[PDB]
Amino acid sequence: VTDPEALLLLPRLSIQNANAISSPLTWGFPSPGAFTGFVHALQRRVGISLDIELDGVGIVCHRFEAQISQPAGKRTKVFNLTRNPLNRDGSTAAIVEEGRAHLEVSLLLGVHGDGLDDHPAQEIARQVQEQAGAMRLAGGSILPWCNERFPAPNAELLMLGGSDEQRRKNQRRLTRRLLPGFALVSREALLQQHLETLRTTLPEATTLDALLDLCRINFEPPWQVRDKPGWLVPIPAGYNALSPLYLPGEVRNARDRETPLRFVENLFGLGEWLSPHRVAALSDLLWYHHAEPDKGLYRWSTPRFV
Amino acid sequence: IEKFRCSHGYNEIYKYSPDHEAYLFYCKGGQGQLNKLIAENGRFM
Amino acid sequence: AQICDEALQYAARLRELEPGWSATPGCQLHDAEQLWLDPLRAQTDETFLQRRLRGDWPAEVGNRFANWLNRAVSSDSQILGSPEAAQWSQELSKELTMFKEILEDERD
Amino acid sequence: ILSTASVLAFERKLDPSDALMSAGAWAQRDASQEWPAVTVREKSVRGTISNRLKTKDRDPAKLDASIQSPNLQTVDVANLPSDADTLKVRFTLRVLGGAGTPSACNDAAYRDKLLQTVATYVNDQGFAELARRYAHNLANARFLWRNRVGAEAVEVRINHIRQGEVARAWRFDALAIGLRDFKADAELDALAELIASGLSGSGHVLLEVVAFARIGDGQEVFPSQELILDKGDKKGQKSKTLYSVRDAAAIHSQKIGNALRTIDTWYPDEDGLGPIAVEPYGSVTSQGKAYRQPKQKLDFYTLLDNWVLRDEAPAVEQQHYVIANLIRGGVFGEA
Amino acid sequence: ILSTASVLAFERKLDPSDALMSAGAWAQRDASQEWPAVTVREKSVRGTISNRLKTKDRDPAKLDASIQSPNLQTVDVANLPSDADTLKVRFTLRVLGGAGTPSACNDAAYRDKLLQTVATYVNDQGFAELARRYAHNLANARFLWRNRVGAEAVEVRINHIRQGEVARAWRFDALAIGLRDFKADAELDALAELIASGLSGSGHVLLEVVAFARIGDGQEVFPSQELILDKGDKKGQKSKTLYSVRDAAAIHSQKIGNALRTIDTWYPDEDGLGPIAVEPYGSVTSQGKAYRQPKQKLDFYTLLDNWVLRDEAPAVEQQHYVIANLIRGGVFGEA
C-alpha cells in the first residue's frame, strides 16, 4: 500500500507465551498475521487519538525459545503443555495441545499521518510504547522490562531525509540498533519460480510440493545436500475463502453481529529469515494487509521488498 | 597409495595424511575396523 | 555475504551482551580489534579509550578476516594460476568493502 | 602340527635412555659433569622456493610472483655456544637378558618350541657375535647420528655402573673404529663380554655412555626432531620442532636404540653398503629400500617360522639376525 | 630407463654458525677477544603515514585526520657503543665434503649414476673453481650484509683451526677484494686449496672467520631480523625484533650461508648484475626476479636431469652451478 512517512521502532519486546503453532502445517515462530493484527490493534487503540496511521510491521526476533522437548529415541519434538483445571466432577479435562514460545522481537512499524507534525516524535513513540506495554502479541503477554539495567527506549526515525546520505546514515543507525535479530520477509516470487523450475523437472507439480522441497534437506547422488539460498521457512500467508461471505446477523455464534463472517482456510506461502542489513532499505521489510474481499484471498506479505 | 594402514599386531589404524608424507594414528582396531573404514571412506585416497 | 552477516552478528551479540571484553586485563586480548568492546571502552573510559577509538576509527578487522577467509579456498597451484582466484579475490574484496563500510560507522 | 602362536610380544632388551646433549670445551672433558646443556631455541628462516615444479607452474610470471611471496617459518635450532666446540651426548643403556622368552604367547607348545630353539642357539653360540656388534655400535659413536658426520675427533666413554659407581671404564676413539667394519680389540672384547653377560641373564649390566665430539665453536648440533601441530598461520609456521626433556636438547631413546641395532651385515644384497638396523624385512628409511624381502627367504618372519615350526635352522649369520630381532622386541604374530 | 629418484635429500656442506657481532675500537683488533657484545635494545619510534594511497584516501580532510593520529612502535635496535667504531662479526664455518652422496635416495640405480656423475666431475676438475669463489665470499666480507655498505675499512681474518689452535692464519682487506670480481691472489689460492681439501673430503676443515668493519662511533649495525607474533595493541606493537643468541646480537646462520653461496656468475642474464646466490631457479629475493627460469634450460633441475639421466653433460660453468647446488643441499626429487 502507501509508503510510510516515518518508521517507528518498538524496541526489544519480550513475549512470554506466544503461539508456537503458527498454522496446521507449520510450528515455530508465530504467524506474521499476529504482528499485522497487533499493529492494527495498536492503530485501533491509539492511532485514532494521535491522528496517525500505524501500518505495516517489521519483524526482527532477537531471540526465540519454543517450549518444546525432544522425546527419547525420536527425531521429532513435542510441546510442553499446561495443566488446565478439572471439570465439575473432578475428572481431568481433555488436553488440547497449545504451543508456547518465548520471543524477543522488535517491531519496525510504519507510521504516516498528520499527527507527526502536531506532536513530538518521542511523545508519540512513548505513547505507543505505553500502550503496547498492556497488550499481547501472539497470545503471549508482553513483558515490560522492569528493574533491569536500563529500559530500551524508542526512536521514531523520520523516513523523509534531507539527503540520501542522511537517510542512509540514520537508517544505518537504526539497523545497528536492531542488529542482533533476523528480519522476516515474504518471498513468494522465489516460491513461484521454484514452482516453474520444478514443473520443468516433472510436470503437474503443485507449489505445495515446491514449498515442501524448499523446506526439506534433500540429498543428491553424485552424495551432496542441496544448497538453499538463505533461511527459507514456510509461513502461513493469510486465508482463502471456503464459504460465501455471510451477513453480520446471519451466522450462528459469531464474535459479533455487526461484522460479516466467512469460513476460511490457511494459505501457506514462504518466508526468508535474513539479517536486517541485507535489504539496504528499511522502508521495505514491512508486513501489510491485502484483502481483496470479493474473491477471498485475505493475505499478508511484504510488498515493495525486491 | 593406500588411505588406511592397519598395524596388525598392535591393533592400530593409521590413516594417510598428505601434508607430511606419512601416516598418522587414526584409531584402534584390527581388520574389521580397517575394512569398515575402507567401506566408509574408500581406499587409495 | 552470509559469512560477513554472521561475523557482524557474532560481533554485535558479543558487543551488546556481556561486559566480558573488558572483564579482566592482561597482555593478550588481540586489542587491535576494538569492535567486540564498543561500549566497554566508551561507556567506562570517557577520554582514555573513547577518544582513542573515535579518532582512530578501528575498522581494520576486514583484512585479518580476509586472511582468515583465504583459507576457505584450497591452496592449489592450478586454482591460483587460473582466473578463479581472480574472481574469488574481486568478490571477496567487494564483500570486505561492505564489511568495512558497516564496521566504520560505530561512533554514531 | 605346531602352527605359529597368534600372539607373541617380545619385550625390548637393550633399553637406552634419552640422550642428553650438553656442550663445553675439549681438553676438559674430564670435568664435564657441570657442562651447560645445549638449549633448543627458535630462529626464523625465510626461503625462496626450490622444490621441483610440476610443469604447470613453469610460467616465469607465476614463478616470479611466487618467489615475491616467500615462505616465512620459525625453526627450532640447537647450536653449541660460541665458546664451546665439544658436544657431550650422555645416555644410559640397560642390557636385560632373557632374550627368547616372550612376554605374551597363546600357544604353550609353540612357546616351549621357541624357548627350546633360542636355548639351543645360546648353548651352541652365546650372545658373542651380537654383543660384539652392539659393543661396536657403542664404541664408534653411531648414536651421534648427524653430530658425527663432520666431527674433528669423537671419543666415547663407557662406564659399567655397579652398586653406585663405575666398576669398569672404557675409552674409545670413535673415528678409528669405523662405522662399517666389526674388527677385534682388547677393550671391545671386554665390552662385548660385558654385554654378553648382560644378554645371557648372568648379570645386571647398566652402562653409562658418554660421547664427546669436536664440532667447532657455535656449530649446529642435531637433536632428535619432533612432529608439529600445524594449527596456525603460515608465517609463524613452526616448520621444525626439536626434542628436549627439560630445557635441554636430546636425542630420542629409540633413535639411540636404532643406532645400536645397526649390526645386520648379513642381508642378501651387497655388503659394501654397510650394516643396517635389525628389522623384519630389514629396511632403511633413508634409502627407502627393504632388504630381506619375503620373496627371498631371508626376512625375519620366514626365517623364524622355518627355525621354530619346521626345524629348518638357517645359517649362523641368519640366526644371529633372528636372535637380534628377538632382542629388538615387537609383536610377531598374526591377526 | 633410469628415471629420477622420488626422494633426494642432500645435506648442507659448508655449515656456518650464527655470526656473533661484538664491538670495539680499531687498531686494537689484535686484542679483540674480550670485546663487549653488541646488545639489542628497544626504542620507540613515531611515524607519519608515508605509504602510497589508493585514490580513496586522497581526501585532504581524511589524510589530515590520519596524520593527526601517528602510529607508535617499539623497535629493537642494535648500535655500536659511543666509544667504539668497529664491528667485529665472528662465526665458524665447517667445510664437510662428500658433496655427491645424497642423505636419502630411493632408486639405487639413480644414486649410483649420480655418484658416478659427481665423481666424473671431481676427477675432471676438482672443487677448485667453487672453492675459489667461496674463498672470495669469505675474503670480501659479503656476510656483513648491510654492515659492509658504508664501512670505511673492512678486514677479514680467517683462521684454520686444527686440534685446538690455529694451523694457518689469513688476513684480508675486504674492500680491495670486490664484491663482483673473482680475481686471483696468493693468499686466496691458499684458502681455495683449503676449502678444496675440505670439500673433497680429504681433510677436516674448520675455519674461524672474524671480520672487522670501521663503521663509526655509535653507528647502527644490522643483525638478522626475527619475525613477530602480532598479538598486542597498536601502541606497543614491537614491530621489529632482532636476532640475538644470549644478550648478544647475531646474524642467522642461513644468512651467512646465503652470502657465502653468492658465486653464481653463470646465469643467462647480464653479468653486470653481479654474482647471485646458488639456488635452483636461481633467484634473488630482493630483486623479486628468478634467473635460470625453467623455460630456459638452465635451472638446476633440468641441468641435473640432463646430466645424470641422459648423459647430456652441460658446459663446465653450468656444472659448476650444479655441483654448487649439491654443496648447497636441499630437498630435490618429485612426489
From Swiss-Prot, chain C:
Residues annotated as transmembrane: none
Signal peptide span: none
Consequence of gene disruption: Mutants lose phage DMS3 infection-dependent inhibition of biofilm formation while there is normal biofilm formation in the absence of phage infection. Decreased production of crRNA in the presence or absence of phage. Disruption of the entire Y.pestis-subtype CRISPR region disrupts crRNA production but does not alter phage resistance (possibly OLNs PA14_33350 to PA14_33310, and the flanking CRISPR loci), indicating this CRISPR is not involved in phage resistance.
Domain of life the protein comes from: Bacteria
Function per UniProt: CRISPR (clustered regularly interspaced short palindromic repeat) is an adaptive immune system that provides protection against mobile genetic elements (viruses, transposable elements and conjugative plasmids). CRISPR clusters contain sequences complementary to antecedent mobile elements and target invading nucleic acids. CRISPR clusters are transcribed and processed into CRISPR RNA (crRNA). Cas3 and Cascade participate in CRISPR interference, the third stage of CRISPR immunity (Potential). Involved in crRNA production or stability.
Extra information: In this bacteria, Y.pestis-subtype CRISPRs do not confer resistance to phage DMS3 or MP22, but instead are required for DMS3 infection-dependent inhibition of biofilm formation and possibly motility.
Family that this chain belongs to: Belongs to the CRISPR-associated Csy1 family.
Subunit structure: Interacts directly with Csy2; part of the Csy ribonucleoprotein complex with a probable stoichiometry of Csy1(1),Csy2(1),Csy3(6),Cas6/Csy4(1)-crRNA(1). A Csy3(6),Cas6/Csy4(1)-crRNA(1) subcomplex is also formed.
Protein name: CRISPR-associated protein Csy1
Organism, scientific name: Pseudomonas aeruginosa (strain UCBPP-PA14)
Species lineage: Bacteria, Pseudomonadati, Pseudomonadota, Gammaproteobacteria, Pseudomonadales
Gene that produces this protein: csy1
Parent-protein residues present: 327 to 434 of 434
